[PDB]
Amino acid sequence: QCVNLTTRTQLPPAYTNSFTRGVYYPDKVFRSSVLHSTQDLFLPFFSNVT
Amino acid sequence: YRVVVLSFELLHAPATVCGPKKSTNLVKNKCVNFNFNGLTGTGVLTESNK
Question: Fewer C-beta within 10 Å: chain A N or C terminus?
Answer without folding.
Answer: N
